Ligand binder design. Structure first.
Ligand SMILES: NS(=O)(=O)c1ccc(N2CCN(CC[C@@H]3OCCc4ccccc43)CC2)cc1
Ligand SMILES: [Zn+2]
Length: 256
């Protein structure tokens, strides 16, 4: 599976029939069709920078993984009774600045999207068990609008030179990803899925109303990462964004 013509999001249903399910992500948030929900608490993030572990080139993208053995790094509040434990963050981006986000707002595409992924450690023992469960994952999505260089991205961008090719990894320590989140934590939420295979309908999405910035040059650094293993012909990671999927009667709630 991948993002190419031959293995891309249009082909995914062949290997993963859930691709055409009823709770697929991402979606276009229509602001006129959302519903202010009264019982949504604010989002509380409390991350410990010592839980940052490793940055990895996975060939379609790159992941920053966290230690998830205890509750040092948690997401609380919003639509949740339970505490969710941080395990990874990553980005999606497009061929050019014109597209790149997975979620769209009133049909407007942003240049990139930040995902912060968490698992339900109140109800399940591991990521392995939580990952396939209706209530198992919580991902925060932040839309990234092309403009001014984002200095909080610097430590991430500075690490990419050590994981240029597929399978390469390095230590990535002493990092609190709440520093990447926008000042306002006003959000939308809907029940949904992983935006790539295995596409489990296990995700409660938290989509920030406020965007963060990224430069054209910072997006060039993402696209300068390589999908091939060391010594093969260089294949740039041009894009890794899935097109928006039908709501199929689901309701997007707003905190605001
Ligand atoms: N773009 S996104 O934010 O929707 C997003 C997409 C994919 C992920 N991945 C990590 C979590 N997923 C859990 C399933 C995983 O792979 C299958 C085997 C297996 C075994 C044991 C434990 C876990 C797993 C895998 C992909 C996370 C977030
Ligand atoms: Zn993602």
């Amino acid at each position: 599976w991948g993002y190419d013509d031959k293995n891309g999001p249009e082909q995914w249903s062949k290997l993963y029939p859930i691709a055409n399910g009823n709770n697929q992500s991402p979606v276009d948030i229509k602001t006129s069709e959302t519903k202010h929900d009264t019982s949504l608490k604010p989002i509380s993030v409390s991350y410990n920078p010592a839980t940052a572990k490793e940055i990895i080139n996975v060939g379609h993208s790159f992941h920053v993984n966290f230690e998830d053995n205890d509750n040092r790094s948690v997401l609380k509040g919003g639509p949740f009774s339970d505490s969710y434990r941080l395990f990874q963050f990553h980005f999606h981006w497009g061929s050019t600045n014109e597209h790149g986000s997975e979620h769209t707002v009133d049909g407007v595409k942003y240049s990139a999207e930040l995902h912060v992924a968490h698992w339900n450690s109140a109800k399940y023992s591991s990521l392995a068990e939580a990952a396939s469960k209706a209530d198992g994952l919580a991902v925060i999505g932040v839309l990234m609008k092309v403009g001014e260089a984002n200095p909080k991205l610097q430590k991430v961008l500075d690490a990419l030179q050590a994981i240029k090719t597929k399978g390469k990894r390095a230590p990535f320590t002493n990092f609190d990803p709440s520093t990447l989140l926008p000042s306002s934590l006003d959000f939308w939420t809907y029940p949904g899925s992983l935006t790539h295979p295995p596409l489990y309908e296990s995700v409660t999405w938290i989509i920030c109303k406020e965007s963060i910035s990224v430069s054209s040059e910072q997006l060039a650094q993402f696209r300068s990462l390589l999908s091939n293993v060391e010594g093969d012909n260089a294949v740039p990671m041009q894009h890794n964004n899935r097109p928006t999927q039908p709501l199929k009667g689901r309701t997007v709630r707003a905190s605001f």
